Amino acid sequence: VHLTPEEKSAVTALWGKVNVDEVGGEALGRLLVVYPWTQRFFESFGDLSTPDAVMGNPKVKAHGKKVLGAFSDGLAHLDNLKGTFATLSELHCDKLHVDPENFRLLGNVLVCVLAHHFGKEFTPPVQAAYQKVVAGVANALAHKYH
Amino acid sequence: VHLTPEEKSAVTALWGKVNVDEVGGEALGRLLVVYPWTQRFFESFGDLSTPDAVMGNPKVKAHGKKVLGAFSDGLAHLDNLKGTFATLSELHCDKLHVDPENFRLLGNVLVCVLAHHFGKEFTPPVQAAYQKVVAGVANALAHKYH
Amino acid sequence: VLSPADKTNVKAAWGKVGAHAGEYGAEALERMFLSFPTTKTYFPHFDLSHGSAQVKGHGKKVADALTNAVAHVDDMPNALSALSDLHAHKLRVDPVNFKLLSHCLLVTLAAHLPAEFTPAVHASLDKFLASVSTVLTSKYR
Amino acid sequence: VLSPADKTNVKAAWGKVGAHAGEYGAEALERMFLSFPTTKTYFPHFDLSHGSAQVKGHGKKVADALTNAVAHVDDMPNALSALSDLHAHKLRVDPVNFKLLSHCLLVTLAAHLPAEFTPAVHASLDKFLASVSTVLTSKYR
Numbered sequence: 001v002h003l004t005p006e007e008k009s010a011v012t013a014l015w016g017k018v019n020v021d022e023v024g025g026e027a028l029g030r031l032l033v034v035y036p037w038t039q040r041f042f043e044s045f046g047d048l049s050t051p052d053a054v055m056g057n058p059k060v061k062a063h064g065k066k067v068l069g070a071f072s073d074g075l076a077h078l079d080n081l082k083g084t085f086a087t088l089s090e091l092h093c094d095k096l097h098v099d100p101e102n103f104r105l106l107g108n109v110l111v112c113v114l115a116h117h118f119g120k121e122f123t124p125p126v127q128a129a130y131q132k133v134v135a136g137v138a139n140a141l142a143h144k145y146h
Numbered sequence: 147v148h149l150t151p152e153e154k155s156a157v158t159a160l161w162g163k164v165n166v167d168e169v170g171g172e173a174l175g176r177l178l179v180v181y182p183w184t185q186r187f188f189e190s191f192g193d194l195s196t197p198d199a200v201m202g203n204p205k206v207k208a209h210g211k212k213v214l215g216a217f218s219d220g221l222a223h224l225d226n227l228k229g230t231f232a233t234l235s236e237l238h239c240d241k242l243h244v245d246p247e248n249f250r251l252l253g254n255v256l257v258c259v260l261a262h263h264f265g266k267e268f269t270p271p272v273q274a275a276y277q278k279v280v281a282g283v284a285n286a287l288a289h290k291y292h
Numbered sequence: 293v294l295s296p297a298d299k300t301n302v303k304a305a306w307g308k309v310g311a312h313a314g315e316y317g318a319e320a321l322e323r324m325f326l327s328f329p330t331t332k333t334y335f336p337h338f339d340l341s342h343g344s345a346q347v348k349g350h351g352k353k354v355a356d357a358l359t360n361a362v363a364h365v366d367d368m369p370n371a372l373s374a375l376s377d378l379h380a381h382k383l384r385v386d387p388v389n390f391k392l393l394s395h396c397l398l399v400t401l402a403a404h405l406p407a408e409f410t411p412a413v414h415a416s417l418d419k420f421l422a423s424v425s426t427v428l429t430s431k432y433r
Numbered sequence: 434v435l436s437p438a439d440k441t442n443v444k445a446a447w448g449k450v451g452a453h454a455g456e457y458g459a460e461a462l463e464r465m466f467l468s469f470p471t472t473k474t475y476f477p478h479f480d481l482s483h484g485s486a487q488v489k490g491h492g493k494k495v496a497d498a499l500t501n502a503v504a505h506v507d508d509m510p511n512a513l514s515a516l517s518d519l520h521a522h523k524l525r526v527d528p529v530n531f532k533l534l535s536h537c538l539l540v541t542l543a544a545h546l547p548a549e550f551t552p553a554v555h556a557s558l559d560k561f562l563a564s565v566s567t568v569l570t571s572k573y574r
């Protein structure tokens with residue numbers, strides 16, 4: 001994850017704007033709605049049976065917020081994504097046994113969510129930069145499998 | 147790529163037996179036959195139109211042999227798969243732009259080929275060890291994309 | 293496989309896209325090429341810069357096929373079978389690249405229709421884009 | 434989509450597998466579980482050790498469904514549709530795991546039939562295993 005001054009300019013300018021209150025619950029909800037086998041990991045959480053149930057679940061919007069944290073984290077330490085994510089990688093790999101592919105899918109729904117939210121400002125060059133980052137994180141989370 | 151003494155015992159015992167003359171051309175041929183979009187990278191090579199053409203191509207059996215080299219290489223340096231594969235990763239990533247997924251697929255056809263060749267000796271514990279390695283290499287080749 | 297709901301949703305979202313589907317396709321291609329540089333290798337002849345005329349041109353054609361699929365969603369194999377031979381048979385298109393483009397298509401649609409890009413509809417559009425992709429690679433599989 | 438050649442090949446390879454398909458299934462499951470530990474999470478109730486009786490038991494059932502598919506290869510959606518609801522609808526099976534098991538099935542078949550595991554047949558078996566997998570996850574897609 002190397003990022004040019006301009007990519008970094010495109011990522012951090014955008015991310016400051018981001019409603020860290022809601023977007024994190026949008027991403028997670030949409031992940032559980034669009035790719036339903038992931039609900040297997042949140043059967044607790046609760047009423048997940050219809051798209052409306054999922055999006056109005058206190059517990060979905062609360063956790064998604066935790067998840068965006070780890071994401072603002074990585075933005076900080078792009079030079080060192082692995083050390084940053086090492087305890088989470090242990091968690092998702094060894095304790096949960098989440099297939100790494102779903103790290104990708106979350107990355108991509110998060111990018112849809114930033115597209116939905118920012119519209120025209122989420123230009124192709126700004127999407128390209130975010131996919132690099134998203135791939136960076138997914139790769140970091142996955143490390144404990146390697 | 148960490149490997150236990152027993153996994154390592156299972157990988158190196160097997161690999162000594164391996165007909166490095168032929169297996170490398172079996173893997174590559176089968177990759178081009180089973181997943182035909184990969185032929186796009188070897189349209190030179192020649193008559194690739196039928197499974198028989200592909201398997202009797204001097205150029206397929208010659209290159210596959212190069213490829214098994216890199217593989218015996220990695221077996222040497224499991225502690226350091228990235229440094230070992232760094233110039234090849236540049237090659238396959240930046241020059242060729244091969245999708246990393248096909249690094250996986252090759253890894254897996256190579257494991258089929260070792261199954262075909264060794265039969266009963268390629269027990270589940272020995273396959274498990276080889277998938278670790280195969281994933282190690284694929285991950286190494288892919289690094290220049292990260 | 294697509295439910296009766298997903299059909300309604302795809303037609304709803306499509307109609308809304310309207311006479312802009314050409315432009316949307318060009319944009320989704322542009323996103324792909326920038327975000328996933330590996331896809332570029334298949335287009336050695338195009339000029340892939342921003343305002344490229346071959347990218348606009350190709351974006352309409354992509355858009356026109358997806359509209360045929362939608363209008364024929366209950367018979368996509370017949371509708372699209374010619375294009376499957378093209379993609380899965382002549383150009384030898386790595387199937388991973390159908391994922392990347394479906395992704396960029398969704399991003400483009402989310403960038404354009406904030407009212408209609410709801411979760412249920414994002415789910416339907418994913419499914420419909422996965423459907424089309426299963427048919428375009430079927431000669432493979 | 435499967436050609437007339439692939440059908441012949443699958444039936445050829447299958448017949449050869451014979452009354453050992455039960456055992457082959459148990460072995461392909463055992464390979465999966467060892468090689469891909471992440472798949473284990475779906476079987477919290479089984480004892481996954483080597484000679485497990487629930488693994489043999491389950492290996493026959495996997496083998497029996499694949500035999501139904503083969504005998505009904507021109508109508509796999511109907512044949513398998515019940516099992517699609519099971520897998521794609523109740524147990525919520527991550528679709529990536531269909532790949533891993535198809536892979537282990539091929540390895541098991543290569544380990545057992547060195548005469549009939551030729552390239553053309555490996556190609557057909559891949560396709561047939563990709564076919565079955567598209568139907569088992571279709572509720573998803």
Ligand code: HEM
Nearest residue numbers: 038041042066067070071092098102103104106107138141
């Ligand atoms: C793309 C990367 C993702 C990130 C950044 C990430 C981040 C996190 C964070 C912040 C936590 C909280 C850990 C803590 O409380 O200290 C967590 C927990 C969790 N994640 Fe993820 N995660 C990711 C993807 C996923 C996926 C794809 C799944 C599964 C479908 C998943 C399943 C879980 C579950 C079940 C927990 C709860 C663990 C517990 O409470 O014991 N995560 N993740």
Ligand code: HEM
Nearest residue numbers: 184187188212213216217238244248249250252253284287
């Ligand atoms: C799983 C890992 C793989 C390994 C170990 C590997 C190894 C190698 C090696 C040893 C070479 C020769 C480099 C040299 O001459 O110094 C090479 C070249 C090549 N590989 Fe791979 N490779 C891998 C996968 C693939 C895949 C999946 C494709 C594409 C479908 C591919 C396409 C090429 C091509 C076209 C060349 C020729 C480059 C040239 O001559 O200019 N390789 N690879």
Ligand code: HEM
Nearest residue numbers: 331334353354357358375378379383385389390393424428
């Ligand atoms: C959503 C699925 C896709 C649809 C709807 C689609 C549709 C089309 C159509 C409508 C054409 C023109 C057909 C003709 O005039 O004969 C075309 C050509 C082609 N497509 Fe696609 N395509 C898709 C995905 C892809 C992807 C994933 C790639 C690979 C990165 C690809 C590479 C090409 C190539 C190389 C050609 C010929 C372009 C040229 O050389 O002028 N397509 N596509």
Ligand code: HEM
Nearest residue numbers: 472475494495498499516519520524526530531534565569
């Ligand atoms: C080649 C595709 C597969 C076929 C042929 C298949 C077929 C079957 C069959 C025949 C049953 C028993 C059905 C019944 O008695 O109602 C079963 C159950 C099940 N399968 Fe599969 N399956 C496949 C792949 C998978 C994979 C990839 C996983 C996930 C790792 C999976 C997880 C399970 C689970 C959890 C159940 C219930 C087991 C239990 O709790 O007792 N299956 N499968």
